[PDB]
Amino acid sequence: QGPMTHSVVELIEIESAIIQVKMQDRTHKNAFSQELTDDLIQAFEYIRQNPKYKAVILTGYDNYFASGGTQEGLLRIQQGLTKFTDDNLYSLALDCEIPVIAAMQGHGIGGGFVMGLFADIVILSRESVYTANFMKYGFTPGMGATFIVPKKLGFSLAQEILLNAGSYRGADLEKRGVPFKVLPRAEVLDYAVELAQELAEKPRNSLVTLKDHLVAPLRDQLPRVIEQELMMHE
């Protein structure tokens, strides 16, 4: 059990084959500060260098899973200061060789919600808020949102989520028919742990061979969608 460089991501081994990546940039409520960006990329590179793990649980702290762009960063784009860069926090889970469970025990906002959606198994908390809120800032969505939201939540619910940038409680999404398990926040991480243990029962090579096949169309199609979304910004 170890912190990354900036100490705002903590890695905990749950058994020898399960790694939990806990995001805890409390100063920024797990918004994508420079420190959370570096520590997250460090976490997944460590996972990539340590093939003992068969499953990853990605989770937040307290009431926050991940909050997406920082308020400063969004403001700077809105004005004549910076532009949207492609990055690649959003696809950490997708690029991971092994199954990733996004245990979203807390709010998932903008790029934060999108990051969780690229995981193989996503669990929501009934009391938390989830929103792809890019268009509230006046901007079309980025970070692969226009691809992964319809892929995981279906075409129709994605139109509303993306065009209107509304906030949904986990309870609201459960009642609109989402395929994600939705639980009380207090139960979200235990359930992710149980499921990771069941996944760890499989040969590692079988997990990886199947995940490579299930996500090949996503890994293959995402660069083109990123280019479209950059185009939209203009």
Place this chain on the structure above:
Amino acid sequence: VLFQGPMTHSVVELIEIESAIIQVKMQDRTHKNAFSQELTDDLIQAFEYIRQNPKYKAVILTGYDNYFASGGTQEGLLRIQQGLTKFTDDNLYSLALDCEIPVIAAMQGHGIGGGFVMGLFADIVILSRESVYTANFMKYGFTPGMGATFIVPKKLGFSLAQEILLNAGSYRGADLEKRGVPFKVLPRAEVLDYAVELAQELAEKPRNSLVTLKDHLVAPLRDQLPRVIEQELMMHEKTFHHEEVKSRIKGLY
């Protein structure tokens, strides 16, 4: 300052609900919002007006009382069965898809056949708990047209579309809600109020972002639809012109 007026046949009313929200209210009470010539012309005219006046951010398409849209008139269906007309002769099916801004289909009343299907092309669809919805084409003996074989699986998923399209059954909105559909379902008396609120939230965004985003989200729909229409017209050539379709339309309408 916020206009409200009739289209030329008076069976569609346009109301500017706010400076950037336009409501297209179908009100062919004589035909229960079936596609009479009057309703066909006034819907085309309403969507052209919207295209000619690029200041709106959302459109609400809705019916009156307990009817959203009832589809083909009996006469209209018989004209197709006879080979006088084809469903592509006017194109009501794609009105909401070809609209450059978001459209909300507030289906506060029943949605039947082409009427339900034209609604399903909207970007956001809301159903009423107590209304009936049906892609009822196959009850008359002929295959679904109006792009139904494309937009039903796209919006409600492959599996539920199989059953809705092959069996032509009628579902309450509550039935579809229990089946797991991603559309918001509400008591009829709340459907339009909820559509207006959602249109108000959409109107908080810049119009150019909405149009840019919609173009990107529905590009596959606009790209893929024409081929499926061709295929549906070939299915009609195989199924619509049998004598028993005439007997079913006259007997079961």
Place this chain on the structure above:
Amino acid sequence: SVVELIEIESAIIQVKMQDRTHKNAFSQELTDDLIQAFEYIRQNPKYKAVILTGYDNYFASGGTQEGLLRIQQGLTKFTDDNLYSLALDCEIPVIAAMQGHGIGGGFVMGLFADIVILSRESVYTANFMKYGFTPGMGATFIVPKKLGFSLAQEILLNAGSYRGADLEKRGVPFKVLPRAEVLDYAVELAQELAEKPRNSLVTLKDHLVAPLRDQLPRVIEQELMMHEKTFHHEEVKSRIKGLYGN
């Protein structure tokens, strides 16, 4: 015979799997009799709908233990005899009335029907990965096509067992009923389909499933390429010996 064919009303055919000795696992007898049942249906142009169902608490249980050991040894494959695609290849609509448990390839064969009904009490599982096998028989294509990409990832990667009532609460588009109502509901639905002209049912089915039928050979090849990398290890044989029927 472990498959019984029963006509219902004029144009409905029920295919009833009742290999009670094997709990509707794919014994040699069930395999041969299912193939013959669907060939009889293929040669008979009276029928307008098929009801595929099992007996008591079993819909279809997938490979026998010796069958899975044959696959692990490389003597046979999950796709042999193309049982997995019988309902897709059938020219008329098929209803899988899964009044009982659906396990492994028995589940997947049912999921290629045009309409699938589950029972609340019964267990459903694409359980290939419990043994170390990657999913075969078109599972990687028909589970996401039928139940959506997200739910399919969890079903296929983890090989878990779900009650019909658990899937119902996760949001599946299938009708889920008490077991004692499943076949009665399938019969009402089949009478409703039988109201349509047969030529209309066939013409529309051919269209709605053309993408499945066109893409499925590609997907089968992709599954075979996964299976080459995964099926022949020793620990797949121990898993089959230790976990079968657990």
